[PDB]
């Protein structure tokens, strides 16, 4: 959708003789709190044997970019369960906010691995601070000095059906 | 990473050695028990004494 980054906490059901449990926490990317919390239960289940029937969710909050203007070079880990045995993957996204970078990442995954939301697991989204930590080409292309490139054969878009000009591409 | 994975493979070989020695010794118990369970301890001490040179 238009993603958001929640942070979820969980304190698998307390008991006497084993009270005040360990209070785990995750960062989730989702559209609505409902889906955030579902993903959180599922990630618990996969990490170790917990359940929903035997655990509870403490406080699901939502985070925001402290600087959603400064353009940052995110480097993302991903991994996923499809469609053969799993594997890891490392991609890079020059973008403005982590939730945007993950939007484009889900897009690219669905375009290339054909793989849907079930499998893709975000592991770590890190804002690179230095140049020369970026190594990928298609991101280093824009990290060069004094960039100046023209638009790609900018074709017009029409509102009416019959024109009288033989349009000219710009220029 | 390579040194740490060396140390953890050495952990795996450690569990290997402990299980192999415990299993083989408990299996030697298994064997002498499953032999002597029916027939006489005289015949089992005498087989002890007929193999005693190995």
């Amino acid at each position: 959708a238009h993603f958001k980054e929640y942070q979820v906490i969980g304190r698998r059901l307390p008991t006497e003789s084993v009270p005040e449990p360990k209070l785990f926490r995750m960062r989730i990317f989702a559209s609505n709190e409902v889906i955030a919390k579902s993903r959180y239960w599922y990630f618990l289940q996969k990490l170790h044997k917990v359940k929903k029937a035997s655990g509870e969710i403490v406080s699901i909050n939502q985070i925001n970019e402290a600087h959603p203007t400064k353009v940052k070079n995110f480097g993302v880990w991903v991994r996923y369960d499809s469609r053969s045995g799993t594997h890891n993957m490392y991609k890079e996204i020059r973008d403005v906010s982590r939730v945007a970078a993950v939007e484009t990442l889900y897009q690219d995954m669905a375009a290339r691995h054909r793989a849907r939301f079930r499998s893709i697991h975000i592991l770590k989204v890190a804002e690179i601070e230095k140049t020369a930590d970026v190594k990928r080409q298609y991101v280093k292309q824009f990290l060069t000095k004094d960039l100046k490139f023209p638009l790609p054969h900018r074709v017009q878009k029409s509102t009416k059906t019959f024109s009288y000009k033989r349009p000219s591409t710009f220029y | 990473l390579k040194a740490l994975k060396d140390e953890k493979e050495e952990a795996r070989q450690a569990k290997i050695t402990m299980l192999k020695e415990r299993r083989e010794k408990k299996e030697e118990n298994e064997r002498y028990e499953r032999l002597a369970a029916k027939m006489h301890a005289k015949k089992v001490e005498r087989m002890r004494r007929r193999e005693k040179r190995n």
């Binding site: 480097g75 490392y90 890190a126 690179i128 930590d133 190594k135 | -």
Partner: peptide, 25 residues
């Protein structure tokens, strides 16, 4: 190919020197 090829196992070992030690005492 990750850039932070240093901090990762360091953090895992920071965890492990506690996950091991919080058994005995």
């Amino acid at each position: 190919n990750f850039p932070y090829k240093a901090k990762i196992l360091e953090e895992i070992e920071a965890k492990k020197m506690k996950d091991l030690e919080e058994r005995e005492l």
